[PDB]
Each structure stands twice: as structure tokens, then as C-alpha cells.
Design a binder for this molecule. Structure first.
Ligand code: U7D
Ligand code: U7D
Length: 281
């Protein structure tokens, strides 16, 4: 009902406001000293900026469409909004994959790491991930795929029951490839860590990997689950409101999840953040 949407809009603000300050603190700690690590600050800053841009260019419209005004709207509006949201999510996912690959290439082959990842390669990778996120995303602005308004949830989401090919492409580009790459890159790291632990001391390494995988799955899976289920059965009259509310709740949790998982778990970055926070407070 109206109260349910009001509650959803009210609770959608606190998470985003906390993520905003967390991302700003991370930005300050990462930009104060540019000569940090090696061809990594660029990747972390790219993830941070594609999180902040999504936050600031997505939150106002998503909150304002729930207010009981200008109900008619126009298909073009949410059509362009969903494209922006998908572009930002795809950029974040591709940066995530690149960061995971770099982490695996750093853990394994510790000797000839500098000769394989130069500044030119990092900049080319950043340009490539942005180009892919721009190009491969947003077909429906000109082709297959369409968004529409729903008088049940009124989120003006895209209907997957019209172009199965685009739904399949989004599904594979969302979960399959990133999950496979992450599992393949992390299994070897876990085996090497286990070995090193056995050599040194003649279960700690599994917690971090489990946390990363579980966080990514909890952030991204339900949306793909809903998209896959939409093709067979209807969604307007077959799904309760609370389920859609929880799905749209969990979709935006990645904004707060990413900085904690990838900035606060690093020892040096955590130390410097704590140092700055204690100095200011
Ligand atoms: C009237 C009514 C009917 C059903 N549930 C509630 N919510 C309650 S008691 N606490 C609550 C507050 C904010 C968020 C949540 C969350 F959904 F995140 F768990 C729960 C209220
Ligand atoms: C307060 C008020 C008074 C009069 N009209 C509106 N706008 C309406 S109904 N739809 C609308 C909203 C945003 C963009 C567009 C677009 F131009 F892109 F089609 C259309 C709002």
C-alpha cells in the first residue's frame, strides 16, 4: 500500500547516507597519498567512483517516484533510468572481476609481477572495462528490451517477458562469468595459503573467501532469480509486495557492502583510515 512504499522509501535513505560517508572517507584516505601500492589505487578509485555516481544519480529518482505525484510519467523516463542503473552495475561488476584477477596474479608468481602489470596495462584495462560497460549494456535504448510502469509496485522496471535473448545475456553477464572467474582465481589462492600455513605451523583463510563470495551472491543473486522466473510465470499478480521490496532492498546494499569488503579488509588501508579518524576525532 501507500504506507509500505513510504516505509521502503524512508529506509532506502539511511543505507545510502551511510554508504555516502563511508565512500567519502575511503576517497580521502586513498587520494591523500597517490603513491600507494602499485597500479591498484586506480582500480579501487574506479570502483569507488562508479559506486558514488550510481548512488547520487540513482537515489533521488528512485525515492521521488514513490511520492504520490505526476503518476503518468513517460516510458522514456524509466527506460533511460534503468539503462543508467544497469550501466553502473555492469561497470562495478567488471571492475570487481579485474580487481579479483589482479589479486590472483599478485598472490601467485610473486617474482615476475612488476613485469606483467605496468601502468599502460592498467590504464588500458580501465578504458576497456568502461568501454565494455558502456557498449554491451543499454541495448533497449535502441533495440530488444523494454521498461514499463507497474501500478502494483510502480517501480517502472523493464519486462523480461518480451525479449528472452536480452534476459539471457544479462543473466550470463551478471552472475555466471564473474562467479566462475572468482572461484577459479580463489581456489588456487586458498590452496597456496593452506600449504603455507601447514609449512609455517608444522581455517582462517576460508573465512575471507566465504565472506566475499557470500556478500557478492547476497548482493546480486535475487535480481537474477526474479529475472529468470519472470519469463515463465507472471510477476504483477503472482508475487507478493514484500518480496519485491526485499529484492530492491538487497540490490542497493552493494553500495555499502563494496567499501567494507574491498577497502577495510586491507591492512594498510584499514590502519591509515583508523589513524586519520582518530586524529580528526
Ligand atoms: C507495521 C509493520 C508491519 C511489519 N513490519 C514492520 N516493521 C517493524 S516492526 N520493524 C522494522 C523497521 C524497519 C525495518 C524493518 C526490516 F524490514 F528491515 F526488518 C523492520 C512494521
Ligand atoms: C510537477 C509536474 C508538472 C507537469 N508535468 C510534470 N512532468 C510529468 S507529468 N512527466 C514527466 C516527468 C519528467 C520528465 C518527463 C519527460 F519530459 F522526460 F517526458 C515527463 C511534472
Amino acid at each position: 500500500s501507500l504506507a509500505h512504499g513510504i516505509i521502503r522509501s524512508t529506509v532506502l535513505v539511511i543505507f545510502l547516507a551511510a554508504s555516502f560517508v563511508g565512500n567519502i572517507v575511503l576517497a580521502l584516505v586513498l587520494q591523500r597519498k597517490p603513491q600507494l601500492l602499485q597500479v591498484t589505487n586506480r582500480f579501487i578509485f574506479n570502483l569507488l567512483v562508479t559506486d558514488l555516481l550510481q548512488i547520487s544519480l540513482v537515489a533521488p529518482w528512485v525515492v521521488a517516484t514513490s511520492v504520490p505525484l505526476f503518476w503518468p510519467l513517460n516510458s522514456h523516463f524509466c527506460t533511460a533510468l534503468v539503462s543508467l542503473t544497469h550501466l553502473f552495475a555492469f561497470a562495478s561488476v567488471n571492475t570487481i572481476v579485474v580487481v579479483s584477477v589482479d589479486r590472483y596474479l599478485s598472490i601467485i608468481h610473486p617474482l615476475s609481477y612488476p613485469s606483467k602489470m605496468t601502468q599502460r596495462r592498467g590504464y588500458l584495462l580501465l578504458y576497456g572495462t568502461w568501454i565494455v560497460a558502456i557498449l554491451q549494456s543499454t541495448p533497449p535504448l535502441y533495440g530488444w528490451g523494454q521498461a514499463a510502469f507497474d501500478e502494483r509496485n510502480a517501480l517502472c522496471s523493464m519486462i523480461w517477458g518480451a525479449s528472452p535473448s536480452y534476459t539471457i545475456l544479462s543473466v550470463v553477464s551478471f552472475i555466471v562469468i564473474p562467479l566462475i572467474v572468482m572461484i577459479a582465481c580463489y581456489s588456487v589462492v586458498f590452496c597456496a595459503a593452506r600449504r603455507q600455513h601447514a609449512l609455517l605451523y608444522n581455517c582462517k583463510a576460508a573465512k575471507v573467501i566465504f565472506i566475499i563470495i557470500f556478500s557478492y551472491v547476497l548482493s546480486l543473486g535475487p535480481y537474477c532469480f526474479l529475472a529468470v522466473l519472470a519469463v515463465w510465470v507472471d510477476v504483477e499478480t503472482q508475487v507478493p509486495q514484500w518480496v519485491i521490496t526485499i529484492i530492491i532492498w538487497l540490490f542497493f546494499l552493494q553500495c555499502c557492502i563494496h567499501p567494507y569488503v574491498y577497502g577495510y579488509m586491507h591492512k594498510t588501508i584499514k590502519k591509515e583510515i583508523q589513524d586519520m579518524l582518530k586524529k580528526f576525532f
